[PDB]
């Protein structure tokens, strides 16, 4: 009957003005909003680029007192935390470095440090070997006590530990306000030849023995394969991890955005991507991996620390 042509016009008239008219309505804006969002980014990158013509500079005065390591300085009177020149070897020009003279006893030579994502750690084997980043920043009074992000060269670290066995101490702070720490009585890496293999002894602290135990929230292989002790160093341009040797597809350094002592990847991943906020989904990571300043044993695989450092001290 007539009510037979209706259900042929009661649908078409509706789809045309509902589903179709609607999807068009909605989509448009969504597409417009994007062009908007992107319009910002371009004037962003370009405003900065416009400025990155000239590099930044640090014109801060240099502290008289020096030593051969941050501890030597503390011993000589360096009691404030800032930048100083040290000279661990008589046959090697002195180099600037950030000394922590307030955390756990003091005399700590900062080897690595994250605080504001002001530097990029996705560097190659030579950059990591030679050292990259800013030791410190001018506080305005021309005294450099604001620590910047950096990684003193692995070689440098190596030499330091070969001259005298060190003890490392890791510090980290979440974006909420809390902060734990982890230390090892012994620290020392073999020479480049050995891929700067990592060897640490005796854990202690409230962070979680991620170096000798790995991500203790795992079972069997899943945990052991996240142990950093005994591992060599890797960079995006040099795979030495324990993740399938010949296979160029298994590169922890490629997937976790940083130069580290990966072993079938990690438990502790400082040097990673500096996500801002703390939490970051598995979908935001360039390779769907838990990259970024991660210290599993304390905040899981999907929390990037707001602060992370690695200090060295003899005893």
């Amino acid at each position: 009957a007539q009510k037979e042509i209706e259900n042929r016009y009661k649908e078409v008239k509706i789809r045309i003005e509902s589903t179709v008219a609607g999807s068009l309505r909605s989509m448009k804006s969504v597409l417009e909003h994007l062009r908007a969002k992107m319009q910002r980014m371009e004037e962003a990158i370009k405003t900065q680029k416009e400025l990155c013509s000239a590099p930044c500079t640090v014109n801060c005065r240099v502290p008289v007192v020096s030593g051969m390591h941050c501890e030597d300085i503390y011993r000589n009177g360096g009691r404030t935390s800032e930048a100083y020149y040290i000279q661990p070897d008589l046959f090697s020009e002195p180099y600037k470095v950030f000394c922590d003279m307030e955390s756990h006893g003091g005399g700590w030579t900062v080897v690595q440090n994250r605080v504001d994502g002001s530097s990029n750690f996705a560097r190659d084997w030579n950059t990591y070997k030679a050292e990259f980043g800013n030791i410190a920043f001018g506080n305005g009074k021309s005294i450099c006590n604001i620590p910047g992000e950096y990684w003193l060269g692995t070689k440098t670290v190596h030499q330091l530990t070969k001259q005298h066995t060190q003890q490392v101490l890791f510090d980290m702070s979440d974006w909420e306000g809390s902060s734990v720490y982890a230390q090892y009585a012994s620290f020392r890496p073999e020479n480049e030849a050995q891929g700067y293999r990592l060897w640490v002894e005796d854990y202690s602290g409230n962070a979680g023995n991620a170096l000798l135990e790995g991500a203790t929230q795992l079972m069997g292989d899943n945990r052991t394969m996240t142990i950093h002790n005994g591992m060599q160093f890797s960079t995006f341009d040099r795979d030495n991890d324990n993740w399938n040797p010949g296979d160029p597809t298994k590169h922890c350094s490629r997937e976790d955005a940083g130069g580290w002592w990966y072993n079938r990847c990690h438990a502790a991943n400082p040097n990673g991507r500096y996500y801002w906020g703390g939490i970051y989904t598995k979908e935001q990571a360039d390779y769907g991996t838990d990259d970024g300043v991660v210290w599993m044993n304390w905040k899981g695989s999907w929390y990037s620390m707001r602060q992370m450092a690695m200090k060295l001290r003899p005893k």
């Binding site: 790995g214 991500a215 795992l218 899943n222 993740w243 079938r264 990847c265 990690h266």
Partner: peptide, 4 residues
């Protein structure tokens, strides 16, 4: 994290 560990790898598959």
């Amino acid at each position: 994290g560990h790898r598959p």
